[PDB]
Design an enzyme around this catalytic site. Sequence first.
Site, PDB file in Angstrom:
ATOM      1  N   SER A  45      42.350  45.336  45.528  1.00  0.00           N
ATOM      2  CA  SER A  45      42.838  44.273  44.662  1.00  0.00           C
ATOM      3  C   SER A  45      42.484  44.485  43.196  1.00  0.00           C
ATOM      4  O   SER A  45      42.962  43.723  42.348  1.00  0.00           O
ATOM      5  CB  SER A  45      42.298  42.925  45.139  1.00  0.00           C
ATOM      6  N   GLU A 143      49.717  46.536  52.502  1.00  0.00           N
ATOM      7  CA  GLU A 143      49.605  47.913  52.973  1.00  0.00           C
ATOM      8  C   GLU A 143      48.660  48.745  52.117  1.00  0.00           C
ATOM      9  O   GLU A 143      47.970  49.629  52.638  1.00  0.00           O
ATOM     10  CB  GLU A 143      50.983  48.572  53.009  1.00  0.00           C
ATOM     11  N   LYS A 209      36.996  41.740  38.190  1.00  0.00           N
ATOM     12  CA  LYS A 209      37.956  41.641  39.279  1.00  0.00           C
ATOM     13  C   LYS A 209      37.405  42.462  40.429  1.00  0.00           C
ATOM     14  O   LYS A 209      37.084  43.642  40.255  1.00  0.00           O
ATOM     15  CB  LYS A 209      39.342  42.144  38.870  1.00  0.00           C
ATOM     16  N   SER A 210      37.288  41.840  41.591  1.00  0.00           N
ATOM     17  CA  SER A 210      36.692  42.469  42.752  1.00  0.00           C
ATOM     18  C   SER A 210      37.784  42.909  43.715  1.00  0.00           C
ATOM     19  O   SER A 210      38.980  42.760  43.457  1.00  0.00           O
ATOM     20  CB  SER A 210      35.713  41.513  43.435  1.00  0.00           C
ATOM     21  N   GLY A 211      37.364  43.457  44.844  1.00  0.00           N
ATOM     22  CA  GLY A 211      38.304  43.811  45.884  1.00  0.00           C
ATOM     23  C   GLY A 211      37.588  44.298  47.120  1.00  0.00           C
ATOM     24  O   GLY A 211      36.442  44.754  47.060  1.00  0.00           O
TER      25      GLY A 211
HETATM   26  C1  LIG Z   1      41.483  42.669  47.106  1.00  0.00           C
HETATM   27  O1  LIG Z   1      40.945  43.682  47.386  1.00  0.00           O
HETATM   28  N1  LIG Z   1      41.888  41.764  48.175  1.00  0.00           N
HETATM   29  C2  LIG Z   1      42.593  40.451  47.969  1.00  0.00           C
HETATM   30  C3  LIG Z   1      41.816  39.314  48.606  1.00  0.00           C
HETATM   31  N2  LIG Z   1      40.396  39.313  48.167  1.00  0.00           N
HETATM   32  O2  LIG Z   1      40.242  39.769  46.827  1.00  0.00           O
HETATM   33  S1  LIG Z   1      38.617  39.949  46.639  1.00  0.00           S
HETATM   34  O3  LIG Z   1      38.030  40.660  47.826  1.00  0.00           O
HETATM   35  O4  LIG Z   1      38.288  40.658  45.354  1.00  0.00           O
HETATM   36  O5  LIG Z   1      37.937  38.624  46.385  1.00  0.00           O
HETATM   37  C4  LIG Z   1      41.786  39.548  50.059  1.00  0.00           C
HETATM   38  C5  LIG Z   1      41.081  40.806  50.355  1.00  0.00           C
HETATM   39  C6  LIG Z   1      41.672  42.028  49.649  1.00  0.00           C
HETATM   40  C7  LIG Z   1      42.960  42.428  50.386  1.00  0.00           C
HETATM   41  N3  LIG Z   1      42.868  42.828  51.797  1.00  0.00           N
HETATM   42  O6  LIG Z   1      44.012  42.422  49.850  1.00  0.00           O
END
Ligand SMILES: *C(=O)N1C[C@H](NOS(=O)(=O)O)CC[C@H]1C(N)=O
Length: 263
Positions: A45, A143, A209-211
């Site tokens: 993300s 995906e 911004k995390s992911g």
């Molecule tokens: C980003 O990696 N994503 C979008 C959402 N969570 O964002 S977060 O982890 O930075 O807070 C769901 C998890 C993930 C995804 N599987 O897309």
Amino acid sequence: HPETLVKVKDAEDQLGARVGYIELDLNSGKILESFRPEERFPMMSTFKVLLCGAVLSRVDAGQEQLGRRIHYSQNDLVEYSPVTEKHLTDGMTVRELCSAAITMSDNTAANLLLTTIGGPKELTAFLHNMGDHVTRLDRWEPELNEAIPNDERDTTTPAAMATTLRKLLTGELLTLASRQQLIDWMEADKVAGPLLRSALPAGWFIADKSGYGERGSRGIIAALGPDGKPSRIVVIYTTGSQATMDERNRQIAEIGASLIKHW
Ligand SMILES: *C(=O)N1C[C@H](NOS(=O)(=O)O)CC[C@H]1C(N)=O
């Protein structure tokens, strides 16, 4: 500092996976620390920041307007759509969708934004034209979070993302008004609580911004600094660990605690 690097190495030992790390000076663009800087990791993300950078680039040229209202249907809703699932009736503006993509990590918002610019390839073309011949986005949500080992799709390197972020936030690419819209969205992040934000002292600035993805993928990009003004860029990625989410959250926090304490 050696001891921040030591924490990155220990994080590698305890997670049983690769960890990429970059500390960048916001002013000069010089790298203060690095670990596996040219190894590829899934963006997950964290690409949404680069996506809204592309959209603001179109707004500058007059190909896009922040107020344009986009109407979609339930069809477009994909997994994790916290904001877009509430506006099926009235739709959303580009400005609201980018806010949803960054502050809440909305997945449907990201897919809609990708459509306005011409798909993942056109985002890659955007990154290409600003000097990032490394980062590449290839698939849509969800995906792009598969994180197959050795798969180069939807990946970046710690060094490429950290430099590209620096150009997006402080470079000549975007206008002042566009530059501040991106930093304001990142500062309004509400889903990276237990990561770098957990170790931040009072009065510090953070815009991040995390992911997370599959196969234990976790990452964060951040602009931070003391006294409410950013002065460095931090990029941290990891993938391959069988760790739980709370474990991966812990190591990025200890990495954060180290670099704050040896700022
Ligand atoms: C980003 O990696 N994503 C979008 C959402 N969570 O964002 S977060 O982890 O930075 O807070 C769901 C998890 C993930 C995804 N599987 O897309």
